[PDB]
Design a protein around this ligand. Sequence first.
Ligand SMILES: [Mg+2]
Ligand SMILES: [Mg+2]
Ligand SMILES: [Mg+2]
Ligand SMILES: [Mg+2]
Ligand SMILES: [Mg+2]
Ligand SMILES: [Mg+2]
Ligand SMILES: [Mg+2]
Ligand SMILES: [Mg+2]
Ligand SMILES: [Mg+2]
Ligand SMILES: [Mg+2]
Ligand SMILES: [Mg+2]
Ligand SMILES: [Mg+2]
Ligand SMILES: [Mg+2]
Ligand SMILES: [Mg+2]
Ligand SMILES: [Mg+2]
Ligand SMILES: [Mg+2]
Ligand SMILES: [Mg+2]
Ligand SMILES: [Mg+2]
Ligand SMILES: [Mg+2]
Ligand SMILES: [Mg+2]
Ligand SMILES: [Mg+2]
Ligand SMILES: [Mg+2]
Ligand SMILES: [Mg+2]
Ligand SMILES: [Mg+2]
Ligand SMILES: [Mg+2]
Ligand SMILES: [Mg+2]
Ligand SMILES: [Mg+2]
Ligand SMILES: [Mg+2]
Ligand SMILES: [Mg+2]
Ligand SMILES: [Mg+2]
Ligand SMILES: [Mg+2]
Ligand SMILES: [Mg+2]
Ligand SMILES: [Mg+2]
Ligand SMILES: [Mg+2]
Ligand SMILES: [Mg+2]
Ligand SMILES: [Mg+2]
Ligand SMILES: [Mg+2]
Ligand SMILES: [Mg+2]
Ligand SMILES: [Mg+2]
Ligand SMILES: [Mg+2]
Ligand SMILES: [Mg+2]
Ligand SMILES: [Mg+2]
Ligand SMILES: [Mg+2]
Ligand SMILES: [Mg+2]
Ligand SMILES: [Mg+2]
Ligand SMILES: [Mg+2]
Ligand SMILES: [Mg+2]
Ligand SMILES: [Mg+2]
Ligand SMILES: [Mg+2]
Ligand SMILES: [Mg+2]
Ligand SMILES: [Mg+2]
Ligand SMILES: [Mg+2]
Ligand SMILES: [Mg+2]
Ligand SMILES: [Mg+2]
Ligand SMILES: [Mg+2]
Ligand SMILES: [Mg+2]
Ligand SMILES: [Mg+2]
Ligand SMILES: [Mg+2]
Ligand SMILES: [Mg+2]
Ligand SMILES: [Mg+2]
Ligand SMILES: [Mg+2]
Ligand SMILES: [Mg+2]
Ligand SMILES: [Mg+2]
Ligand SMILES: [Mg+2]
Ligand SMILES: [Mg+2]
Ligand SMILES: [Mg+2]
Ligand SMILES: [Mg+2]
Ligand SMILES: [Mg+2]
Ligand SMILES: [Mg+2]
Ligand SMILES: [Mg+2]
Ligand SMILES: [Mg+2]
Ligand SMILES: [Mg+2]
Ligand SMILES: [Mg+2]
Ligand SMILES: [Mg+2]
Ligand SMILES: [Mg+2]
Ligand SMILES: [Mg+2]
Ligand SMILES: [Mg+2]
Ligand SMILES: [Mg+2]
Ligand SMILES: [Mg+2]
Lengths: 65, 116, 151
Amino acid sequence: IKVRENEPFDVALRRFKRSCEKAGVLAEVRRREFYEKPTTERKRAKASAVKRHAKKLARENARRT
Amino acid sequence: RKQVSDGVAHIHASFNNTIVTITDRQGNALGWATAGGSGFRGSRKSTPFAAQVAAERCADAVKEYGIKNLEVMVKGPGPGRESTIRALNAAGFRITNITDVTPIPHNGCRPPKKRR
Amino acid sequence: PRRRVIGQRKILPDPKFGSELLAKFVNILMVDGKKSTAESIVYSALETLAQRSGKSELEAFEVALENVRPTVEVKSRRVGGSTYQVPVEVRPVRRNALAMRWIVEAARKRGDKSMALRLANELSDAAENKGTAVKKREDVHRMAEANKAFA
RNA sequence: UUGAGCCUUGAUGUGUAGGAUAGGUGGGAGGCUUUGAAGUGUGGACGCCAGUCUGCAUGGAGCCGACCUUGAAAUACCACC
RNA sequence: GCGGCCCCCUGGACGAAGACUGACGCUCAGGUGCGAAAGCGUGGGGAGCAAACAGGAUUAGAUACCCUGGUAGUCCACGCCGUAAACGAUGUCGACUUGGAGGUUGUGCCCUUGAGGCGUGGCUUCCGGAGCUAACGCGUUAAGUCGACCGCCUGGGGAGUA
RNA sequence: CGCGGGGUGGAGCAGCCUGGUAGCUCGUCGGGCUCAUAACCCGAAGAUCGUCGGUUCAAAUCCGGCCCCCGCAACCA
RNA sequence: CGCGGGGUGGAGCAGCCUGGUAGCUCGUCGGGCUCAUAACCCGAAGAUCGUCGGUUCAAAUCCGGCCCCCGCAACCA
RNA sequence: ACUAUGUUCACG
Ligand SMILES: [Mg+2]
Ligand SMILES: [Mg+2]
Ligand SMILES: [Mg+2]
Ligand SMILES: [Mg+2]
Ligand SMILES: [Mg+2]
Ligand SMILES: [Mg+2]
Ligand SMILES: [Mg+2]
Ligand SMILES: [Mg+2]
Ligand SMILES: [Mg+2]
Ligand SMILES: [Mg+2]
Ligand SMILES: [Mg+2]
Ligand SMILES: [Mg+2]
Ligand SMILES: [Mg+2]
Ligand SMILES: [Mg+2]
Ligand SMILES: [Mg+2]
Ligand SMILES: [Mg+2]
Ligand SMILES: [Mg+2]
Ligand SMILES: [Mg+2]
Ligand SMILES: [Mg+2]
Ligand SMILES: [Mg+2]
Ligand SMILES: [Mg+2]
Ligand SMILES: [Mg+2]
Ligand SMILES: [Mg+2]
Ligand SMILES: [Mg+2]
Ligand SMILES: [Mg+2]
Ligand SMILES: [Mg+2]
Ligand SMILES: [Mg+2]
Ligand SMILES: [Mg+2]
Ligand SMILES: [Mg+2]
Ligand SMILES: [Mg+2]
Ligand SMILES: [Mg+2]
Ligand SMILES: [Mg+2]
Ligand SMILES: [Mg+2]
Ligand SMILES: [Mg+2]
Ligand SMILES: [Mg+2]
Ligand SMILES: [Mg+2]
Ligand SMILES: [Mg+2]
Ligand SMILES: [Mg+2]
Ligand SMILES: [Mg+2]
Ligand SMILES: [Mg+2]
Ligand SMILES: [Mg+2]
Ligand SMILES: [Mg+2]
Ligand SMILES: [Mg+2]
Ligand SMILES: [Mg+2]
Ligand SMILES: [Mg+2]
Ligand SMILES: [Mg+2]
Ligand SMILES: [Mg+2]
Ligand SMILES: [Mg+2]
Ligand SMILES: [Mg+2]
Ligand SMILES: [Mg+2]
Ligand SMILES: [Mg+2]
Ligand SMILES: [Mg+2]
Ligand SMILES: [Mg+2]
Ligand SMILES: [Mg+2]
Ligand SMILES: [Mg+2]
Ligand SMILES: [Mg+2]
Ligand SMILES: [Mg+2]
Ligand SMILES: [Mg+2]
Ligand SMILES: [Mg+2]
Ligand SMILES: [Mg+2]
Ligand SMILES: [Mg+2]
Ligand SMILES: [Mg+2]
Ligand SMILES: [Mg+2]
Ligand SMILES: [Mg+2]
Ligand SMILES: [Mg+2]
Ligand SMILES: [Mg+2]
Ligand SMILES: [Mg+2]
Ligand SMILES: [Mg+2]
Ligand SMILES: [Mg+2]
Ligand SMILES: [Mg+2]
Ligand SMILES: [Mg+2]
Ligand SMILES: [Mg+2]
Ligand SMILES: [Mg+2]
Ligand SMILES: [Mg+2]
Ligand SMILES: [Mg+2]
Ligand SMILES: [Mg+2]
Ligand SMILES: [Mg+2]
Ligand SMILES: [Mg+2]
Ligand SMILES: [Mg+2]
């Protein structure tokens, strides 16, 4: 997070923040995530992942492209 | 009168506002400006430009103190901050460093109820 | 047109002042397809303008049209859900054409006597920016300048 | 401590005429200058940013009052506010 | 149902190769025990959140949704409650019947000869064969093929009510 | 019977105790929008003010009778 | 009873003690906006100082009254 | 952002 960028540079470049926290503090601990709903919305994000990964193996179809 | 060399610019960038407040080394507040105080009321108050103008309005009204360089301590998420820091250069300061003070509770208080 | 990118038709030069800028101005002024009546008025207006201003006709019409020209105009898009004021940089073809409308639209009102008199007086006021057409550009800027928060 | 009253002293005070970031009024025409000057290097006090004010010195002993613009004349000396 | 880190006492699980006991087992009507959340009693505690409640918007109305407040509750000690879409909507135990890709925790054999490999056990996620199924689907963790015992079902409303 | 207060378009209220030209929120009526109805937008009409009377230049508004309506009193023995 | 302050477009405010330039927020109509409504934003329509009097180069401004103006402590016929 | 309703039996 503590980003100096030497001296001649300035132009923000603080992906250190954006690829670390932000989403964790904000869109998660902003409003009430009802204990059960994570167990639901994770397991569907998790089921959607292997759905794509299993399909990616069988994605090599005829195509003709 | 005083004439401080360096300072710190705390930016409380919420969803609805962006409060810019310039302080000294020991956190002694020297002057401030907001998106709502700049004009920009309602929908306009939550934009990157209405943050920029607030930091420009905070850049002046701290000239009696005569700050050459300052650090940045952004807070909250908001539309501002990735825009407000641009304004502090364009106004006339040197950014020594950029940091966060974004309050991350290690699962502490129950957050408010989810809305629909 | 939804995906039909086709250009526009070519126009023609006006015999006595063979160019293009004022050829379009005749067309925007014209009512009921009467280009004979309209083109006589524009010559009558620009001759009376050149007498008073002490310039030619093209440069007299230019130092007038630029003073009523919009730099930015206001649209409003709903991207996400809500409706808010989005200013945009006007295109160079429409830029001077949108000005020519505001001169003529102002000259419909302001009932002096003749049309040739009214356009001459409107373009005369445009040269010293104190007419109705400059006020319509002035208001258009005030929207873009005030509603600059929205990109 | 930081207020208010109060004397010494020192500035301060740009409708417009306009060489003047001049409040009203006045003793009345030489002050001052070698009781080491005009112009300025530089920085301070002030600043409605028009242009005041001045530490010290390379410099070296001049600068200038009625005149012309004002409802008013010059902090050149000096009295009272 | 159970997530900061540390000690105190403590139940089980799995593996390794033995030694021992010698059918001591499997189910279980009545019965007992545990049993989320919300409740209930008594004594604390109370930041945040928040039923009820109040005000402001919304609306034709708004006892709602949105906004600002905000008490029981939510937390702890000791009892009571005994229910949930308490759900793999799939009773418990055992045997048997092609596979593949992972994860996770074991344990043995060679070179640890370099984040190796090669085997044999538990638990587990996904896709599929035969077979089954009304179909959807299930598919060695069966809803396949059989056995033991239990619970339950018999049109919808009335009613899981009197 | 006694003393306050009322009676105003179709509804509920102002304007009434200081006499000069009657509003508000609904509904009714006309036109829009909609496939149509509601909602919504846009115009419009609609009360001589309980009645019989007096005062006045003129009374919904002042004063008197009568006709209803509503409250309070109707007590000591 | 007083001594005091206070007095502006329709209205709330300052500005009024150191005379030369009456601002500022809601009521105001036209825009831009959008398939539209709300908002939001831009500019327009109104007081020469409640009002009358002295002086002085210039007076809401300095000074006296009023209508009056509210505050007060005092007023025990 | 909010945004209600569509009388009865029939025709297939
Ligand atoms: Mg769960
Ligand atoms: Mg909230
Ligand atoms: Mg843990
Ligand atoms: Mg703990
Ligand atoms: Mg143990
Ligand atoms: Mg064990
Ligand atoms: Mg044995
Ligand atoms: Mg034996
Ligand atoms: Mg034996
Ligand atoms: Mg039984
Ligand atoms: Mg039983
Ligand atoms: Mg129990
Ligand atoms: Mg509980
Ligand atoms: Mg309790
Ligand atoms: Mg009780
Ligand atoms: Mg008890
Ligand atoms: Mg207690
Ligand atoms: Mg309690
Ligand atoms: Mg308590
Ligand atoms: Mg509490
Ligand atoms: Mg307590
Ligand atoms: Mg709360
Ligand atoms: Mg709430
Ligand atoms: Mg309650
Ligand atoms: Mg309520
Ligand atoms: Mg509705
Ligand atoms: Mg209503
Ligand atoms: Mg309401
Ligand atoms: Mg309610
Ligand atoms: Mg409510
Ligand atoms: Mg209770
Ligand atoms: Mg505990
Ligand atoms: Mg407890
Ligand atoms: Mg029990
Ligand atoms: Mg049950
Ligand atoms: Mg469960
Ligand atoms: Mg589950
Ligand atoms: Mg399971
Ligand atoms: Mg069940
Ligand atoms: Mg079971
Ligand atoms: Mg069992
Ligand atoms: Mg059992
Ligand atoms: Mg089995
Ligand atoms: Mg196998
Ligand atoms: Mg396998
Ligand atoms: Mg494996
Ligand atoms: Mg496996
Ligand atoms: Mg291997
Ligand atoms: Mg195994
Ligand atoms: Mg599985
Ligand atoms: Mg199965
Ligand atoms: Mg499955
Ligand atoms: Mg399968
Ligand atoms: Mg197997
Ligand atoms: Mg197999
Ligand atoms: Mg398996
Ligand atoms: Mg096997
Ligand atoms: Mg097995
Ligand atoms: Mg099995
Ligand atoms: Mg297995
Ligand atoms: Mg079976
Ligand atoms: Mg079956
Ligand atoms: Mg049975
Ligand atoms: Mg039975
Ligand atoms: Mg039955
Ligand atoms: Mg039963
Ligand atoms: Mg029940
Ligand atoms: Mg029962
Ligand atoms: Mg009525
Ligand atoms: Mg009237
Ligand atoms: Mg109506
Ligand atoms: Mg009418
Ligand atoms: Mg009639
Ligand atoms: Mg009379
Ligand atoms: Mg009379
Ligand atoms: Mg009348
Ligand atoms: Mg009247
Ligand atoms: Mg008395
Ligand atoms: Mg209905």
